[PDB]
Every structure is written in structure tokens, then in C-alpha cells.
Amino acid sequence: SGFRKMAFPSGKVEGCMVQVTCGTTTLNGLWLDDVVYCPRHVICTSEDMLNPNYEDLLIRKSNHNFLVQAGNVQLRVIGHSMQNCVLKLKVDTANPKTPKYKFVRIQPGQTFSVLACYNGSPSGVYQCAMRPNFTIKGSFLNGSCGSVGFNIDYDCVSFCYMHHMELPTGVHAGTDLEGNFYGPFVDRQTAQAAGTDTTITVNVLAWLYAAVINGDRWFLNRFTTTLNDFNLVAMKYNYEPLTQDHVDILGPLSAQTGIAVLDMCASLKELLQNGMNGRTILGSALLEDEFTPFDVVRQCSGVTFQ
Amino acid sequence: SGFRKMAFPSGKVEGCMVQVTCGTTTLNGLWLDDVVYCPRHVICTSEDMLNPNYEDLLIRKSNHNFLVQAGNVQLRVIGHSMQNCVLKLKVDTANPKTPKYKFVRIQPGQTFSVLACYNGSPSGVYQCAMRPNFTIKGSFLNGSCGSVGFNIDYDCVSFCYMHHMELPTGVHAGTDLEGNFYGPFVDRQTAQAAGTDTTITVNVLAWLYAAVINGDRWFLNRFTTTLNDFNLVAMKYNYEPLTQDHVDILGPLSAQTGIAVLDMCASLKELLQNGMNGRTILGSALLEDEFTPFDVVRQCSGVTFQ
Numbered sequence: 001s002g003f004r005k006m007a008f009p010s011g012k013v014e015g016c017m018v019q020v021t022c023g024t025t026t027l028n029g030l031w032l033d034d035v036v037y038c039p040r041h042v043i044c045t046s047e048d049m050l051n052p053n054y055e056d057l058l059i060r061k062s063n064h065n066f067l068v069q070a071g072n073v074q075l076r077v078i079g080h081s082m083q084n085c086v087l088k089l090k091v092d093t094a095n096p097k098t099p100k101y102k103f104v105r106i107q108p109g110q111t112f113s114v115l116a117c118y119n120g121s122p123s124g125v126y127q128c129a130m131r132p133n134f135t136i137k138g139s140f141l142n143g144s145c146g147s148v149g150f151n152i153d154y155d156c157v158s159f160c161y162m163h164h165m166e167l168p169t170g171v172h173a174g175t176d177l178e179g180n181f182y183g184p185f186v187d188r189q190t191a192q193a194a195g196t197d198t199t200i201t202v203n204v205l206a207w208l209y210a211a212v213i214n215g216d217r218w219f220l221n222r223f224t225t226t227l228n229d230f231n232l233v234a235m236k237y238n239y240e241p242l243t244q245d246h247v248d249i250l251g252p253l254s255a256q257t258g259i260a261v262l263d264m265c266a267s268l269k270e271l272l273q274n275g276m277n278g279r280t281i282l283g284s285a286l287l288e289d290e291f292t293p294f295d296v297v298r299q300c301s302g303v304t305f306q
Numbered sequence: 307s308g309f310r311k312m313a314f315p316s317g318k319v320e321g322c323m324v325q326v327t328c329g330t331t332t333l334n335g336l337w338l339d340d341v342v343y344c345p346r347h348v349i350c351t352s353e354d355m356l357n358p359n360y361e362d363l364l365i366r367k368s369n370h371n372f373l374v375q376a377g378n379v380q381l382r383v384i385g386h387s388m389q390n391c392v393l394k395l396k397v398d399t400a401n402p403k404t405p406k407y408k409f410v411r412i413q414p415g416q417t418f419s420v421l422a423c424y425n426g427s428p429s430g431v432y433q434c435a436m437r438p439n440f441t442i443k444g445s446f447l448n449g450s451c452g453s454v455g456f457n458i459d460y461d462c463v464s465f466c467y468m469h470h471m472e473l474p475t476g477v478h479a480g481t482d483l484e485g486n487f488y489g490p491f492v493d494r495q496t497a498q499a500a501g502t503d504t505t506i507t508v509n510v511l512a513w514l515y516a517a518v519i520n521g522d523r524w525f526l527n528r529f530t531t532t533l534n535d536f537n538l539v540a541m542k543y544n545y546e547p548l549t550q551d552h553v554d555i556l557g558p559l560s561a562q563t564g565i566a567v568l569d570m571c572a573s574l575k576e577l578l579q580n581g582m583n584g585r586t587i588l589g590s591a592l593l594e595d596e597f598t599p600f601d602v603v604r605q606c607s608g609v610t611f612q
């Protein structure tokens with residue numbers, strides 16, 4: 001029993017974190033095989049970021065302009081390329097610690113673990129969701145660029161996020177490991193802000209199913225609802241529309257608890273309309289939307305990774 | 307910016323997790339140098355746990371009654387001893403992955419990271435606090451015994467918790483790595499329950515300081531309070547008394563924000579008396595008490611570990 005925001009074991013990622021220095025700029029990089037991946041704004045000064053031309057800035061750099069430190073050992077750079085907003089530094093040494101890995105671009109609403117790092121050195125690990133507005137509510141200070149987000153499936157680390165910047169609202173923005181930003185953001189100091197966000201409906205439902213699996217049932221009712229009538233209440237409370245594909249995804253949890261998906265939607269409808277009345281669910285006074293259906297199954301059923 | 311329940315990087319602990327089988331019972335063990343540590347109830351059947359005599363049960367076992375699996379390699383046991391509620395199995399191989407480590411018995415209110423494990427295989431990592439009633443609100447299923455809680459300081463892993471059991475309220479109970487239970491609990495199936503718990507006052511205050519460091523100030527006021535008058539409100543809301551040593555501990559955070567500790571106590575007094583009025587602090591509609599003053603400084607200042 002219990003339900004926690006649970007991150008994946010970070011060991012396989014810790015062994016890939018290195019430090020990348022270009023000029024006076026230092027940030028984190030990800031060392032897989034003989035390539036280090038880091039944000040391309042490593043080549044920039046603060047004044048560059050106001051309006052940078054990265055092809056021009058990068059053309060003026062050499063392999064020896066990039067210092068790569070992996071613990072004590074320095075790594076010699078033998079090539080460099082730019083792919084979208086990430087820099088790929090080829091090095092003379094394959095990382096002996098390279099895990100089985102993939103690069104994945106996740107959909108909004110999916111979760112991942114973040115290994116926060118400074119100077120190539122891991123600081124901590126925590127779970128995040130990709131918000132509908134393609135930001136994340138992480139925990140990031142100056143120097144954290146190039147920290148990565150990931151999932152682990154069996155042996156295989158699927159990297160899905162590399163940190164680039166913090167937006168004025170204090171939420172965070174970054175790219176997939178191929179350098180493509182999530183959302184409309186760009187690696188330039190301009191007026192750009194998080195757009196309007198919404199609550200991830202299928203995730204709230206999953207979390208309500210986790211609560212039932214863990215013995216909380218106070219919020220259940222005998223009512224039901226149609227998908228159409230639910231989505232109308234969803235719109236009014238700034239929740240994302242629930243699709244039939246979302247319903248199908250909640251299949252296994254609905255079957256494990258004996259609560260039909262549309263029956264859980266009627267429960268959530270009442271919670272949105274009435275509030276919690278000073279009660280809590282799984283230790284939260286809010287409706288939690290950062291657990292996927294997969295996250296609930298993984299933690300309420302004890303999946304492991306090696 | 308941002309504030310998250312942040313666990314330590316778990317890599318140094320992952321390399322110590324092994325599987326221990328005695329009879330039909332299988333659980334997790336911690337392999338440091340040439341010793342594996344696991345809960346001594348590994349030697350028990352379910353009927354044994356009703357009223358076990360561990361000296362008698364253990365006297366009837368041999369070294370070859372214990373199977374120890376570390377990934378693929380099986381480890382040969384060459385000795386065994388019981389220390390309080392932990393079993394120490396001596397093995398023929400020193401763990402090549404042994405980190406710098408210590409065993410620490412924490413005070414209630416301190417936090418640690420838990421690496422949840424099944425069959426010697428890490429499942430996930432999360433932060434816990436030792437509650438005042440010496441339970442933890444973890445996330446643990448059948449098979450998780452011998453999972454450990456820990457802190458990392460620089461290079462050194464300080465193990466502080468090994469998981470033994472789940473109490474009827476769904477909270478968790480276990481020992482230090484020397485086998486001494488936190489709280490009054492014993493490794494027997496009896497009527498024992500978590501006692502009355504309280505809210506960790508110094509921790510709530512620390513978290514209010516984290517919110518200020520992160521730009522939330524809506525809950526501040528111009529009032530002040532005396533330590534004595536605060537503690538009287540604390541008693542009424544089931545908060546722990548704030549000691550002068552607690553005040554001194556909050557020194558660095560009070561100095562960084564320019565808010566006197568007793569001024570933050572007056573803020574908290576008002577929050578307890580008025581509620582939050584549908585507002586949130588650091589994304590919580592509750593007063594959060596599972597961050598220590600150290601945890602706030604570590605995350606709002608970017609400490610790392612190698």
C-alpha cells in the first residue's frame with residue numbers, strides 16, 4: 001500500500017552525465033557511445049541569446065573550443081555537429097557505461113523522471129509530466145541545462161527531455177534528445193511565455209483508480225455519465241476532453257477495481273462540482289494529474305527494471 | 307525555480323541490491339563489502355510470524371539454507387549472524403560496487419530517499435520522512451522487504467532505513483541498518499498499530515521559506531508571535547512544539563529571505579487558523595511537512611553529489 005510520485009532508478013543515467021564547457025559557459029551533457037549531447041546554447045554568451053544565429057556562431061568554433069569532463073577524465077572532442085537545438089560532440093572514447101537506450105519524443109500528458117544535474121554531477125531525481133502547454137513544472141537552477149528526462153522499460157533507458165531554459169512563470173522548457181523543442185519555444189531570449197494550460201483528464205482518472213486500489217472510496221457514487229455530458233463539465237473546469245481512446249486506456253484499471261470508466265467520470269464530475277470538502281485523496285487536497293494509467297499500474301503492481 | 311519532492315540519485319544504492327531466498331521466502335538484501343544485510347524474518351514462514359523465537363528458528367538453519375543472487379551471479383554464503391532484527395550473511399565475494407557508506411539512525415522528522423525493490427531489482431525511488439510516530443508513508447508491496455532508505459552526502463551513502471512490514475493503516479515500519487526498529491514495533495504478526503501522529507512543525511516552516519525563495523509570498527503578514535504563544539496554537543492543531551533549537555536551525559533560511567523565524571511562525575499561525583482559502587503553496591493545498599531545512603537549502607541552492 002501507499003502511493004507516491006515515484007521516479008525510476010537513476011543509476012543508468014548517472015553514468016552518462018558529463019560536463020561541457022565552451023568559453024565561460026558550462027552546462028551538462030549526455031555521453032552515449034562516443035557522442036556527447038548538450039544544448040546548443042552552450043556556444044552562446046548572454047548577449048548572443050538576445051538574437052542568435054547558431055549556424056554563424058557555431059561556424060566560428062573548433063573542436064578544441066569544447067571541454068568535456070567526465071568525472072576526472074577529460075574527453076577529447078574529435079568532431080561536432082548541430083542537430084536542431086542540440087549539439088553533438090564526437091569524442092575519442094566510447095562511454096563504458098552506455099546503457100541500452102532509445103530517444104523518444106513523448107506526447108503531452110506523459111510522465112518521465114528528471115535527473116537534475118550541475119557541472120556534470122547529479123543533484124537529485126524527481127517525476128515530471130509534460131503539460132498540455134508543453135512546459136514542465138520541474139526544479140531547475142542556473143547550471144542545470146542539459147539535464148535529461150527519461151523512462152526505463154526493462155533494461156532500456158528512453159530519453160525524452162533535455163532541459164534548456166526557464167520561462168517567466170517559473171515553468172521549464174526543453175527539447176527531445178534530437179533537439180526539437182516541446183511546444184512553440186525557441187532557444188532565444190525573447191518574449192515567449194507558457195500558453196494557457198489545462199488539466200490532464202485521463203491522468204486524474206487514473207489517480208482516482210489508484211486511490212480505489214489503495215482503499216480510498218469516499219468519492220465514489222452510484223451515478224453514471226455519458227462521455228458527451230462528462231466532456232461538457234470538463235470544458236467548464238478547464239480539463240482536457242476525454243477521448244474514447246482515453247477510455248480504452250483506462251480499461252485495465254477499470255477492470256481491476258470493478259468501476260466502469262464512465263462511472264469514475266461521474267465521480268470526478270461530482271468532485272469538480274462540489275470540491276473535496278476538506279477531505280484528501282492519497283494525501284492530496286488537489287486533484288492530481290501527473291500520474292498516467294501506466295504509472296498507476298507500475299506502482300500498484302510492483303514492476304521492476306534491470 | 308520550482309520545488310519538488312526530490313530524491314537523491316540512486317545509482318550508488320542500486321549496485322548493492324541483491325536477492326535473498328530462505329526456503330520459500332524471498333526478499334531483498336543490501337550487499338556492502340562481503341556482507342549482505344536483510345530482515346531476519348526471511349527465515350520465517352507465515353505461521354512462524356504469529357509468535358516467532360528467532361534464536362530458535364535461526365539455530366536450525368545452515369549457511370547453505372540461504373540463496374543470495376546478485377543479478378546473474380549467485381553468491382556463496384560463508385557465515386551468518388543475527389544483529390537485533392537484521393540478518394548478516396557473510397559471502398565469499400566483496401561487492402565491487404560498494405560505495406563509501408555509513409549506517410545512521412535518524413531522528414523523527416528527518417527525510418531520506420527510498421529505493422523500492424523486488425527480487426533484488428530496483429523498482430523506483432522516492433522521498434520519505436520519518437513521522438513523529440516512527441512510521442513512514444512509503445509505497446511498498448509484497449516482496450519489498452529489505453528495500454532501504456538513505457541519504458547521500460558528497461560521496462558517502464548514509465543508510466538509515468530497511469523495510470520490514472506494513473501496519474494496518476497502510477503506513478510502513480522498519481529498522482535502522484543495525485536492525486533496531488524505529489518506534490515500538492516488533493517483527494511479529496500481532497496487534498500493533500501506529501500511534502497518534504503529529505505534524506512536523508519545523509518542516510512546515512522550512513517549506514514556507516522555500517515558497518518565499520521561489521516567489522510565493524501571499525501568506526506572509528506583518529504580525530509576529532512569541533515562541534510560547536505560537537506553541538499554544540501548535541498544540542491546538544496537533545503540530546509538534548517548536549524548540550529554540552528548531553528556531554536556530556531555521557537561521558540560514560530566515561537570513562536568506564529576511565523573514566524572522568517568529569515572523570514565519572505568525573504566518574503559519576494564520577494559515578492554521580484561517581485555512582488556505584482555495585489558494586495553494588508550491589502546488590499544494592495542504593501544509594507540507596516532509597521537507598527539512600536541509601532539504602530546502604539543498605534544492606534551492608543546487609548541491610550535488612559524486
Ligand SMILES: CNC(=O)c1cc(Br)cc([N+](=O)[O-])c1N1CC[C@@]2(CN(C(=O)c3cncc4cc(O)ccc34)C[C@@H]2c2ccccc2)C1
Nearest residue numbers: 041044045046049140141142143144165166187188189307
Ligand atoms: C531564467 N531565464 C531563462 O532560463 C531563459 C528564458 C528565455 Br524566454 C530565454 C532564454 N534564453 O534563450 O537565453 C533563457 N535562458 C537564460 C540562461 C539560460 C538559462 N540557463 C540556466 O542555467 C537555467 C536553467 N534552468 C533554470 C534557470 C533558472 C534561473 O533563474 C537561471 C538560470 C536557469 C543558462 C542558459 C544560458 C544560455 C546561454 C548563455 C548563458 C546561460 C537560457
Ligand SMILES: CNC(=O)c1cc(Br)cc([N+](=O)[O-])c1N1CC[C@@]2(CN(C(=O)c3cncc4cc(O)ccc34)C[C@@H]2c2ccccc2)C1
Nearest residue numbers: 001347350351352355446447448449450471472493494495
Ligand atoms: C501487510 N502486513 C504486514 O506487513 C505485517 C504487519 C504486521 Br503488524 C506484522 C507482520 N509480521 O510480522 O509478519 C507483517 N508482515 C506480513 C508479511 C510480511 C510483510 N511482507 C511484504 O513483502 C510486504 C512489505 N511491505 C508491504 C506489504 C504490503 C502487503 O499488503 C503485503 C506484504 C507487504 C513480507 C513479510 C513476510 C514475513 C515473513 C514471512 C512471509 C512474509 C511481514
